[PDB]
Write a protein that binds this DNA or RNA. Structure first.
Ligand SMILES: [Mg+2]
Ligand SMILES: [Mg+2]
Ligand code: NA
Length: 221
DNA sequence: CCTGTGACAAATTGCCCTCAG
DNA sequence: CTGAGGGCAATTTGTCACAGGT
């Protein structure tokens, strides 16, 4: 089963937001949104020991992952559409005791994490915790936004949108590099590392490729 | 314009080791 | 013991020249 992993549930506004976070920062961001989703002033807490347990890390590496990611949030903003930009943190994180980190999520991000009535993305945390490339995590979440109860779905993602919201590096505006370093890589991780089985076709307009059309089912069928 | 691939650079990985308390 | 440090080599991601229209 996967029912025992924490059910991550985020607004589509966040699934579609424009930002650049590392894998480690997105791993924590899941836990933050989960904490905020379960009650708020934006003040969340990471334990090194539980982070290590969740993500299959040693204490030392989980301490390292968390400390370095927390420092890297500074200067990072997230832009929400459907244009509004917010800093993720409004205070540096601090450790009030060994193994514990207190973080100050911008309380104006809370609605954007929670979202509207039925416009949300859900996945068990187990589905995303073995993905390594943060862009593959972005792709996974977008796919999950269109997932049906039976774990299947189909969605056309425009490439300029992917580039803008996932904030892909500039060289991936060259479509061969997009294919090789983003698309094939992230689809391979999802197939290798999640319960989702994913294929895609490219949509052309004249000489250009404009959209990637993703179709997926769950291994459980 | 478009494509894929080789080559190189930068980033990131899981590991390793030390040591304070 | 944990976890806050500093460190590593191998691997992956990010970039671009070049060759050719597959
Ligand atoms: Mg609180
Ligand atoms: Mg790490
Ligand atoms: Na790597």
């Amino acid at each position: 089963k996967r029912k025992n992993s924490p059910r991550i549930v985020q607004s589509n506004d966040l699934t579609e937001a424009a930002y650049s976070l590392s894998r480690d920062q997105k791993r924590m961001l899941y836990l933050f949104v989960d904490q905020i989703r379960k009650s708020h002033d934006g003040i969340c807490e990471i334990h090194v020991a539980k982070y290590a347990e969740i993500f299959g890390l040693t204490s030392a590496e989980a301490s390292k992952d968390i400390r370095q990611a927390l420092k890297s949030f500074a200067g990072k903003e997230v832009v929400f559409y459907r244009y509004e930009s917010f800093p993720w943190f409004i205070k540096p994180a601090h450790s009030p005791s060994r193994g514990l980190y207190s973080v100050h999520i911008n309380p104006y991000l809370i609605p954007f994490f929670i979202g509207l009535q039925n416009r949300f993305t859900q996945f068990r945390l187990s589905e995303t915790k073995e993905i390594t490339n943060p862009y593959a995590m972005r792709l996974y979440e977008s796919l999950c936004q269109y997932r049906k109860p039976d774990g299947s779905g189909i969605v056309s993602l425009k490439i300029d949108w992917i580039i803008e919201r996932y904030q892909l590096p500039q060289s991936y505006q060259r479509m061969p590099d997009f294919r090789r370093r983003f698309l094939q890589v992230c689809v391979n991780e999802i197939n290798s590392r999640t319960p989702m089985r994913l294929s895609y076709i490219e949509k052309k307009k004249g000489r250009q490729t404009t959209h990637i059309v993703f179709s997926f089912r769950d291994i459980t069928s």
